[PDB]
Amino acid sequence: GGIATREAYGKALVELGQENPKIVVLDADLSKSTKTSDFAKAFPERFFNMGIAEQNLMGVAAGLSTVGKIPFASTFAVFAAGRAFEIIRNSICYPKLNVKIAATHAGLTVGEDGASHQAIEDLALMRVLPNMQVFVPADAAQTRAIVKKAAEIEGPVYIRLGRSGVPEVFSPDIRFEPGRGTVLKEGKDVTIVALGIMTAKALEAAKMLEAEGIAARVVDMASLKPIDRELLVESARLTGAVVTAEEHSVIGGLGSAVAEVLSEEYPIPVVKVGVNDVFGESGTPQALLEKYGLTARDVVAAVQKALTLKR
Amino acid sequence: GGIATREAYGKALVELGQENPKIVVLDADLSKSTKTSDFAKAFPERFFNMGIAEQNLMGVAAGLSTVGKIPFASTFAVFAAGRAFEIIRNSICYPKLNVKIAATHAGLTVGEDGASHQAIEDLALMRVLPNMQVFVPADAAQTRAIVKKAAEIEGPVYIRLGRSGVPEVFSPDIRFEPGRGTVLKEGKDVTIVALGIMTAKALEAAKMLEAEGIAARVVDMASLKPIDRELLVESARLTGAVVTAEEHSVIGGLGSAVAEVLSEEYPIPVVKVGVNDVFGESGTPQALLEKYGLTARDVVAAVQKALTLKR
Amino acid sequence: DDMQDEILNLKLIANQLRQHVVKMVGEANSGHPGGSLSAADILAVLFFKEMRIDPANPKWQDRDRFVLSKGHASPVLYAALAERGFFPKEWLSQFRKINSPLQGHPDMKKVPGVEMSTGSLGQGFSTAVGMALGLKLDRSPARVYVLLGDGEIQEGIVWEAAMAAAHYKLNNLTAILDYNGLQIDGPVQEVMNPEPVADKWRSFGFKVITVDGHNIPEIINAIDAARLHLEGPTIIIAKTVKGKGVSFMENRVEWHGSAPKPEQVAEALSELQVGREKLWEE
Amino acid sequence: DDMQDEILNLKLIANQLRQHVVKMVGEANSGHPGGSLSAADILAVLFFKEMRIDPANPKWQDRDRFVLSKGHASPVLYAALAERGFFPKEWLSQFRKINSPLQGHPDMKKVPGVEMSTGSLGQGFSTAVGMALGLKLDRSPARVYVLLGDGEIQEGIVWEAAMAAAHYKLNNLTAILDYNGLQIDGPVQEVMNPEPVADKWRSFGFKVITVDGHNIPEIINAIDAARLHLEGPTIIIAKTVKGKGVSFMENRVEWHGSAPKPEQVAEALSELQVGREKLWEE
Ligand SMILES: CC1=C(CCOP(=O)(O)OP(=O)(O)O)SCN1Cc1cnc(C)nc1N
Ligand SMILES: CC1=C(CCOP(=O)(O)OP(=O)(O)O)SCN1Cc1cnc(C)nc1N
Ligand SMILES: [Ca+2]
Ligand SMILES: [Ca+2]
Ligand SMILES: [Ca+2]
Ligand SMILES: [Ca+2]
Ligand SMILES: [Cl-]
Ligand SMILES: [Cl-]
Ligand SMILES: [Cl-]
Ligand SMILES: [Cl-]
């Protein structure tokens, strides 16, 4: 029972605004919902609402980055990654400009707004962009570490955030390093690689597996791009089987990124837990996670399948 | 040397217009270049130029599809897949509307217009959309078969097309079936899976390999979504090693699709020939393919690497 | 007077739509009362007088079409479609619930009488231009009605669609702007000012008619004037009160997307029922 | 006096830019002569009179900025930057070649003096609004000049960017429209008519000045009027001839994106050299 990653983001932005006069923040009439509203209240002269205009949001952010500002641009993930995709591509990533995109309301945990608002594709879109770094915090502590690191990095960054409160995984002392994943639990039988809301569920699955004599390694991979290739290969050598778990399509996200690495370096089973190439629907976050197979019990089922496939 | 896939597309549209009264065609001030100009001349009453307005191009196509028309919407791949991504997502794919997107000038073979125009991400974007089918013709004969099939099937289709003349691969008798790939050559040592311009280069690489005692199977996978899972597993069981070859980023396209399938079903090496997570640049098509590693000799080098990993 | 009785009946239907909106958002614990209540008189006129539609023939090829481009106002569309007989009124009690047909934004594949899946702002308007283009090609007598928000017109696709509707002479397209002055982060003039709004629509080739969006005779007269304008499309700029009909919601930014608690549903229904009893006095 | 000598020198520079455009597109076998030649008088005025820039200090924080939103006209920008001394004139002979800095569309990380990587229509204008917003916050004396095409203004992002520039009162942004009437598939009025163009820009909150885009004194005077207007942004609508200066290219749709063959380069340079000799007569 921790705060939402969007709430941790809003507080981290105010901290950055206090530390660094070059930070500016933009939104697209969703400041109340993304939690850029905290910064908007503290620093109104460095906050720019662009109205309901996500293509121009990202173009204006690109231009601000060339006048000595470090812009954070926010809206919901479907609109940030998708409506503005080709502006991010040609005005931010190609020229390698210093823009941070902090997109909230990703995944099914958006809930009742339903399919048009539930981003299940945003990691596929941001991972394919050259020069983009893609970071997916698990909880409030890792959100604060990732937001502060994104402000220090020179170049494009996408931070994926969520609507709903999520359980604590990391301590307040967490240090975020791009290209490094974290072993949260050791085990010889299988590795569960997860990010976002699925990291806490992977730890719950690992407790359920221990109760039936299966020892799962659990890896958090908030750093989706650049991914921790060395930790994936180490996990493959130790355990011989991987389950991936993501609040995202099984196409083009974490499962895809892990399959790409291990198929070229150390080929082993990679069984993917995620949204099965469908759109979502309106419902409570918990009812949606149950229906679409994003629960600890679904991770346990995927581990049982992976164990039948391993050498 | 054969005609460009865009030229085969423009001729196939006229053939459809002669036999199918429901076909309508839209462009975004690139009719001269996409070759929708052939249909525009033959059936001006069913041709709609939307000007330089790709979001509205796709929304107007969606609306036309609800009044019993079968729209083909064209522009360059970077603008079709990227500028209009979220309109394709929320007005076409979510409601499963009967819109065909035929996007030309994909890949590096665009040439001198350079990085902003060279689509290296479009297959990753279209593959992650639920309800989207993604078809990538190798040559003129397969382009004609794919365009005619797209008009017959119900629902969203993305057809990826190119600028320049490409070699003949398929016979005039070619039959296209969504979800089915084609074995173009048998071999026990390795499988090369290719689509688009890379299929002809895979066949040239297989001739070079035969000369050094390596027997390569060559598979065309124009049907990227739905992919031919059964043919990939058959190929993996026969040969124990795969090279994928695509005029696209190694992230999220054919290499990704094949790694996802084989990591779930029959883990083997998958060595990926493609653009190495970079943007392109201005140059002649041939100079760009050489610099960015998209030649038959690069496929030969990838096969030698894959064979080092084969069990 | 059949015309005076017709107007009273439309005011009673608008009141019923408002009562449905408050109850269904309350029960869902989720949804958009302010921008639903602002549009209730417009949807009463469209669904109960002006549109040619048949719930016994929802795929009638020459039917008039309504597109809710501001798709978050799904409660007022669902209330109208239920009262017109497109689906059971019992569906309204499962708004925004898992497995319910009544999604938070309209899904054309799940709800009879929903003509487009909307919810991404600007997109419904672009699809409405495509519908009008195809119906013009098919010599249909159909009219395409589309409701826009005044925050929504900050989207570039709206101006692309407007330019295209003028170029293709789509006089069968009638746009309506819910001109309530508010969006999520504040008044539209503070967030991203679209004024002068009528001058923008005229410069994009639309006839502009300004009405009081809570005056049913003015809305009826504006729709008749749109029908008679043949050079191209018309937009009806309908000045409205966000949260119209509920005292504590009227002109309040914070009632955009917040569900009333049971005590607030009871208060709102009491006000609307007092309003309704006063209409039964006429 | 010195004013009339100043104007003659700008006409000679514009002629030199046109000669560079024809030669570099011919040598590349690729590029966009029509929309490069239409803009040569505008870029002569900006790069050789009005803009405060220093080729020895290309990242001077208070420099004026030029954004080529219609990025396919890169030949005329590269000709101007080479003649101003930002990089060697020898670079012009490797336009659009592999491993060469002069990309087909401007690349800000490869070419000194290029302020934004452009080529995707509408995007450069949006970035220019962001530059002006940041420079206004820092109270920089810098001006942001941005050149748009008249096909380019069919993009929705242009109208989003215009609405934002008016809302944020960006008087430090001067837009220029290359109003040549042509795009790829034909005249703009046939493909997707943006008229009435001046009414659209006024309705989006811009001051509008109309000039002959081949009249150097009118361009200078319009830039001064924009500078003196402190309340908000200005757009200069510059009526131009696509292919201006080359008889067989003038007002021709087909010279948008086609490279002249050597016989056509020779003919075009002969006309421009005859034009240049006539200027040396004044
Ligand atoms: C900002 C925003 C809203 C305010 C509308 O404001 P409006 O048009 O003025 O509507 P109103 O009649 O006052 O209720 S809703 C939903 N949303 C998020 C939203 C943002 N971007 C896109 C593309 N689609 C959305 N759905
Ligand atoms: C249509 C098109 C062009 C005509 C411009 O026409 P214009 O603005 O009127 O330019 P002009 O001054 O007359 O040369 S160029 C390139 N292009 C393809 C093109 C399409 N879409 C996007 C987003 N970027 C592009 N680059
Ligand atoms: Ca309730
Ligand atoms: Ca509003
Ligand atoms: Ca030449
Ligand atoms: Ca033009
Ligand atoms: Cl920790
Ligand atoms: Cl064949
Ligand atoms: Cl009422
Ligand atoms: Cl000249």
Numbering used by the authors:
A (entry chain DDD), B (entry chain BBB): 2 to 312
C (entry chain AAA), D (entry chain CCC): -1 to 280
Task: Give passages from the manuscript.
Transketolase (TK, EC 2.2.1.1) is a thiamine diphosphate-dependant (TPP) enzyme which plays an important role in the pentose phosphate pathway. It catalyses the rearrangement of sugar molecules by the transfer of a C2 unit from D-xylulose-5-phosphate to erythrose-4-phosphate, resulting in the formation of fructose-6-phosphate and glyceraldehyde-3-phosphate which are fed back into the glycolysis pathway. Here, we report the biochemical and structural characterization of the ‘split-gene’ TK from this organism (ChTK-F) which has been reconstituted by combining the two proteins encoded on the C. hydroxydothermus genome. This is the first example of a ‘split-gene’ TK that has been reconstituted and found to be active.
Later crystallization trials using PEG based conditions and an excess of TPP and Ca2+ ions resulted in crystals of the ChTK-F α2β2 protein. Changing the precipitant to malic acid (2.1 M DL-malic acid pH 7.0) produced crystals in the same space group but which diffracted to an improved resolution of 1.4 Å and had full occupancy of the TPP cofactor in the active site. The ‘split-gene’ ChTK-F protein forms a heterotetramer with a ChTK-C dimer and a ChTK-N dimer coming together to form a similar overall arrangement to that observed in full length TK and TK-like group enzymes. As other TK-like group enzymes the ChTK-F is formed by 3 domains of the α/β type, the PP-domain (ChTK-N), the Pyr-domain (ChTK-C residues 1–162) and the C-terminal domain (ChTK-C residues 164–312). The PP and Pyr domains are usually connected by a long flexible linker region in other transketolases and much shorter linkers in DXPSs and bacterial PDHs, however in the ChTK-F structure the linker between the PP and Pyr domain is missing. The enzyme contains two identical active sites that contain the cofactor TPP and a Ca2+ ion bound between a subunit of ChTK-C and its corresponding ChTK-N. The TPP molecule has three moieties, a diphosphate group, a thiazolium ring and an amino-pyrimidine ring and adopts the higher energy V-conformation present in most TPP-dependant protein structures. The diphosphate group is held in place by a number of hydrogen bonds formed with residues of the CHTK-N monomer (Lys68, His70, Gly149, Glu150, Asn178 and Lys240). The Ca2+ ion is held in place by interactions with residues Asp148, Asn178, Leu180 and the oxygen atoms on the diphosphate group. The amino-pyrimidine ring is held in place by another series of hydrogen bonds from both ChTK-C and ChTK-N (Glu55C, Gly117N and Leu119N) as well as a π-π stacking interaction between the pyrimidine ring and Phe80 from ChTK-C. The major difference observed when the structures are compared is the absence of the linker between the PP and Pyr domains which could explain the ability of ChTK-F to turn over the bulkier substrates phenylacetaldehyde and cyclohexanecarboxaldehyde.
